[PDB]
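Can't attach files on this board, so I'm pasting raw text. These are the components:
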Amino acid sequence: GPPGPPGPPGPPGPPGPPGPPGPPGPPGSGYIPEAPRDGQAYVRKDGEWVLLSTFL
Amino acid sequence: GPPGPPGPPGPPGPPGPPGPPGPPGPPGSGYIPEAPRDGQAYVRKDGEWVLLSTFL
Amino acid sequence: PPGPPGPPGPPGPPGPPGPPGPPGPPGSGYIPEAPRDGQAYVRKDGEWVLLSTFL
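---
Top answer:
Structure tokens for the assembled complex are below.
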């Protein structure tokens, strides 16, 4: 006799991985720009960030 | 004679695509006004700009 | 006599897509208020550090 007919196909696959990181929120209502980030202290003068050491 | 019985199931499916990009993060908010701009340095205290000299 | 059983079926169907991604971080770029406690603060490393620290 002839060989049996193809068997049913396999079941569905396992869920995938969660999605990528979401983007950060907004700068929406910005008044003052962040000072530099370098392990140094800054004070606010003349509409700018000047090293605090300058005065210490 | 009669054909052989129908074969066994197939291999489960491949894991689906990754998930959707997560939602964006929260607002920056809480931003503050420019300090005076007068050749004087200022520090941030009590939700206001106080002269740095006050403390030197 | 009966023939030989047939071969298993074709691959299964793709699975659901992965869960939703992780919630993003807050906003950045500007200066947010500093603690309001009668203390003076200076801007360092993107944070408000007690001026006294350096006095």
